[PDB]
Design a protein around this nucleic acid. Structure first.
Ligand SMILES: [Zn+2]
Ligand SMILES: [Zn+2]
Lengths: 91, 36, 176, 97, 44, 134, 77, 112
RNA sequence: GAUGGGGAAGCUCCGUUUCAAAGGCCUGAUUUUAUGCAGGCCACCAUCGAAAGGGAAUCCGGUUAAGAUUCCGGAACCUGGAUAUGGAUUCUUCACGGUAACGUAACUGAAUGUGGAGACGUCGGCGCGAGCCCUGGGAGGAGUUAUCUUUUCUUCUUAAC
RNA sequence: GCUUGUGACGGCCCGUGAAAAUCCACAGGAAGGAAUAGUUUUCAUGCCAGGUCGUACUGAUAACCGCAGCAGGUCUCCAAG
RNA sequence: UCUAAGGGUCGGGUAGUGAGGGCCUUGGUCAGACGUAGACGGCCUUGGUGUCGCUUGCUACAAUUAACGAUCAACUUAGAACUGGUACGGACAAGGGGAAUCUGACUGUCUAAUUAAAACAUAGCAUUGCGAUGGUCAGAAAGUGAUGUUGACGCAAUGUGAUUUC
């Protein structure tokens, strides 16, 4: 079930560093150590190699992304706006 | 999707072959040129 | 190797030159990952490597187009005059020939405000918020520097600070 | 809708799922239409287009990746390319989509 | 061609097949020894 | 239905990968010896060297040499093209029974070699006699 | 050290131009828990390699010993 | 219970000073220095260990024959045959695109 | 850390590739001017600095008062060079086989371009191998035996290549 | 089981963990090469040669440093029941 | 002194047709050099160790009891009787524990030889400056050197030093 009520992945830090700091570290840590889907082959085979570098286990593609998650919201919106205004350049 | 689109421009294009007009001629292999 | 754009030449001034991304690698002391991009030397029959700063979305095996008439896609570098209103660039050249000076840190970019009639000038909003006018011939990579959100994670440990700052030139631990 | 006509074809006609089966069908001259995921590698896309041009077969690019195409066809696995061998009930062959 | 239809040889049957191959190869090597022995008279 | 005799394909697997062959006999059903859809094909192992105006007579004669080969090929190991090449000059020599005899392979290769050399000297099918750069 | 199997190759090798010395070695062994039998090793000394031929038949070994060249110098045991 | 020593003068457990223990015809244990293990050569495109190629230290390749170092195919000793197949297909389709695109360009500039 | 340069009254200093004429290579009856070298090709800067990093290749047995992977005996390997015989190949000149992964005793190659190896952090468990440890039978040697113990100890090994 | 080597994996990093000599291969094809005759020293065999300097012994409560032949200090390998 | 539990490897058939491998008990033809002896060996079996069998092709419950048997091996656990104690982790090895107050968040750090902290550092916290014709510094000044393989998620200086709550 649940070995830890609240602390979660932050259980390796014990009682140290303070509750608020452990909470702040928790979300980014969960993002970082997670396994993400691959946009190129469609498999959940993408893991971080270093902060910003994400590699797919299958299809062996390395992509650049966020420090602790594959994509950032800023990058997603920049991608979408580039698409939109280049379409309007065409039109 | 955009990576695939990036490749499409340089490699063989079925849409461009269809736009060329002659289709069955190309299927029979009527146009041939040598480069390099 | 330093992270610099391609040296300016006729191909990038008028048409486009196509390179391919070979690897996306980690640079010691730098937050942003680097991209190795191989181009064909227009004069000599030999391949030339370049070390760009990877933007978010750049991936191995991708085609990167550099020049005035290259597609407005993330990863492609363009003269600022070739891009429309409101675009977002990275590694922006301050002036033609410097090979990139603005918005090089992770998660940072430069927005385009508007162009100029009288000459080839463009104005831009820098990450801090300043509004600067550079030569419209200055190049930039489309997109945002990869590795964003890095500063959001607390270090939590003097040891993590030690490992971070031993690679930099900043003196650690600090005195005075 | 495109998903609805694909569902009708899957529930009524003949289809093959996968690159090797669709290439075999194109080689044997059995296919009518090939639906190709937007996520497919560009080399495979161009090769499939060349095969379909040689076999006089229509090519439609599905909007979405392997997961989307698989779940649209109605399977629980990712599907990259579908070949339509018979569309006796559905009218997907003639529609502009 | 016909479909795969799965199925499997287990462990014991594979052991017996390997044993038969070893016995056959042992006899083949004995025959090779006989061939090496025989030609001595002819060469002498 | 386009894999037939006379079609030109590109070998993509095997020792002759990257060469251009012409299909002399397609067995879509297969056979007992090759239980897969295959094709008897004839191709060029060594392309003739590209000559120019300057080259002398002996130089041209020695640079227009072609080494052919004959092989049974799985369909999955062919990249079929849109081009056609007249196979009638060796349909009789290139057959199923030829591949069972190393000497018959040799004679059939002689036939295919002289046919391809005649076509190249006549100037036909310069793409088929052109080498792929990959 | 190399083991040679063909008797024809062994004889051609013993007639080779660089070969001067050979050795005949006698071993007492058992065949499949059987009676104590004789094994004759012929070791021809080449420039690079010593070539060993193992014969398990005493009569064949004797006849080969007769078949050896005269100029070759043989060391027994 | 027999204890051994390094036989060269390097007294340190370095990467190039690794030993094994072997029993000799004299019935004693002895150290035997072992060379570094060889690495399989890798494909020039994908980086996978290409098969049919011997695994030797770099200087040792100068001693073996050609057959040990190559396979009988284009790019035999350098690429892994799936990369070769993709290279062939890409070259062919690049040529085909050139033909079609040139025809289209000529017709377009005719009708433009 | 020199040279090229530039400083400094000077002993010398700065800098490590530049603001240097920084050196190699191919062809020629360059068809006339009659005994004077012509036409071309390619780009980069010393050197030192590790007996623990990288790195060609040797093992066993024996031998001395004191030597030993170095001597002795036997058995190998590396590098460079000259070359001959066999094999292979060739009148389809520069090999055939295998659908394929690929195979083999070989199976020509200058410029030029490119790739691999060298060549790489730390921790955890899992699998496998080697030496050692423990142990059974049998063939030997030694100890114990006041009483008991088919017993206690020990030899039965195998290098590079 | 112990020591050690090794394989396929997993974890950690805002830390992602040398270079060069050197050897091989690929692409290319300047060329050269056979019929009462050629080629191939990346197959086998055969021939020749390998200079200079270190090499004994200790490595520590007797061989080094502390004015000593000091109850001190000084890197590392093997490791039985 | 017992009891219970925890494993490995091999095991499918005869009812049934007929051939295949090997010293083929005895019996049959061809037939091997050396020192009265003479093996091995180049050929065959319906037999043998209703005509056993070591082998494939197969009908016949192939096993829904292989839910069992033959064979091999290691040390762990749990429990129950009995039994001697002035003692049973018998030597060795090996935490004293608790209730309140002050202090520093912590891990860490320097005083080699009388001063190891309440001081230094630390992640976090806030402020301030800098877009290259720039900032911080070194330097009296410079064809001023570095930071700089640097570009605001950066560089640097300040002051407070975990975190929460009141
Ligand atoms: Zn992927
Ligand atoms: Zn590959």
């Amino acid at each position: 079930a649940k070995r830890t009520k609240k602390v979660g992945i932050t259980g390796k830090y014990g009682v140290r560093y303070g509750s608020s700091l452990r909470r702040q570290v928790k979300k980014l840590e969960i993002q970082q150590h997670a396994r993400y889907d691959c946009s190129f082959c469609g498999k959940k085979t993408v893991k971080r190699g270093a902060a910003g570098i994400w590699t797919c286990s299958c299809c062996k593609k390395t992509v650049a992304g966020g420090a602790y998650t594959v994509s950032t919201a800023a990058a997603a919106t920049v991608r979408s706006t580039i698409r939109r205004l280049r379409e309007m350049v065409e039109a | 999707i955009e990576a695939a689109s990036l490749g499409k421009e340089s490699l063989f294009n079925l849409k461009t072959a269809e736009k060329t007009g002659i289709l069955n001629d190309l299927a029979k292999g009527k146009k041939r040129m040598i480069f390099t | 190797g330093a992270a610099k754009l391609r040296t300016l030449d006729y191909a990038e001034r008028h048409g486009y030159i196509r390179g391919i991304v070979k690897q996306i690698v980690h640079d010691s002391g730098r937050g942003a990952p680097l991209a190795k991009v191989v181009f064909r030397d227009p004069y000599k029959y030999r391949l030339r490597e370049e070390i760009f700063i990877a933007n978010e979305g750049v991936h191995t095996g991708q085609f990167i187009y550099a020049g005035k008439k290259a597609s407005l896609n993330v990863g492609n570098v363009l003269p600022l005059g070739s891009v429309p209103e409101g675009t977002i660039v990275s590694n922006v050249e301050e002036k033609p020939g410097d090979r990139g000076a603005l918005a090089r840190a992770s998660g940072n970019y430069v927005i385009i405000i508007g162009h100029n009639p009288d000459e080839n000038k463009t104005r831009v909003r820098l990450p801090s918020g300043a509004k600067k006018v550079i030569s419209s011939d200055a190049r930039g990579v489309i997109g945002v520097i990869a590795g964003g959100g890095r500063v959001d994670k607390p270090l939590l440990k003097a040891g993590r600070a030690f490992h971070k700052y031993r690679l930099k030139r900043n003196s650690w631990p600090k005195t005075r | 809708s495109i998903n609805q006509k694909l569902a009708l074809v899957i529930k009524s006609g003949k289809y093959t799922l996968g690159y090797k089966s669709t290439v075999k069908s194109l080689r044997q001259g059995k296919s009518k239409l090939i639906i190709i995921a937007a996520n497919t590698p560009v080399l495979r896309k161009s090769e499939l287009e060349y095969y379909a041009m040689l076999s006089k077969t229509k090519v439609y690019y599905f909007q979405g990746g392997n997961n989307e195409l698989g779940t649209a066809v109605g399977k629980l696995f990712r599907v990259g390319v579908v070949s339509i061998l018979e569309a006796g009930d559905s009218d997907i062959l003639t529609t502009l989509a | 061609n016909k479909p795969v239809k799965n199925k499997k040889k287990t462990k014991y049957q594979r052991n017996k097949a390997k044993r038969h191959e070893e016995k056959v190869k042992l006899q083949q090597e004995l025959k090779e020894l006989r061939q090496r022995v025989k030609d001595l008279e002819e060469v002498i | 239905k386009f894999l037939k005799a006379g079609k030109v394909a590109v070998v993509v697997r095997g020792r002759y990968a990257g060469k251009k062959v012409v299909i002399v006999k397609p067995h879509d059903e297969g056979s007992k010896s090759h239980p897969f859809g295959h094709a008897l094909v004839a191709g060029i192992e060594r392309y003739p060297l590209k000559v120019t105006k300057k080259h002398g007579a002996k130089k041209v004669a020695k640079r227009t040499k072609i080494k052919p080969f004959i092989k049974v090929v799985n369909y999955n190991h062919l990249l079929p093209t849109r081009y056609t090449l007249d196979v009638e000059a060796f349909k009789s020599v290139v057959s199923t029974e030829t591949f069972e005899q190393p000497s018959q392979r040799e004679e059939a290769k002689k036939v295919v070699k002289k046919a391809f050399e005649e076509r190249h000297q006549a100037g036909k099918n310069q793409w088929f006699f052109s080498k792929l750069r990959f | 050290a190399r083991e040679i199997t063909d008797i024809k190759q062994f004889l051609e090798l013993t007639r080779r131009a660089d070969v001067k010395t050979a050795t005949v070695k006698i071993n007492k062994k058992l065949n499949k828990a059987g009676k104590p039998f004789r094994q004759t090793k012929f070791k021809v000394r080449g420039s690079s390699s010593l070539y060993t031929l193992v014969i398990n038949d005493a009569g064949k070994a004797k006849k080969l010993i007769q078949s050896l060249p005269p100029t070759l110098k043989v060391n027994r045991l | 219970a027999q204890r051994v020593t390094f036989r060269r003068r390097n007294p340190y457990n370095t990467r190039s000073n690794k030993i094994k223990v072997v029993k000799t015809p004299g019935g004693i244990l002895r150290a035997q220095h072992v060379k570094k293990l060889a690495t399989r050569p890798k494909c020039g495109d994908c980086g996978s260990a290409l098969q049919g190629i011997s695994t030797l230290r770099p200087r040792q390749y100068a001693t073996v024959s050609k057959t040990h170092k190559t396979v009988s195919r284009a790019y035999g000793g350098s690429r892994c045959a799936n990369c070769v197949k993709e290279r062939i297909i890409r070259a062919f389709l690049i040529e085909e695109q050139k033909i079609v695109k040139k025809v289209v360009k000529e017709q377009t500039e005719a009708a433009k």
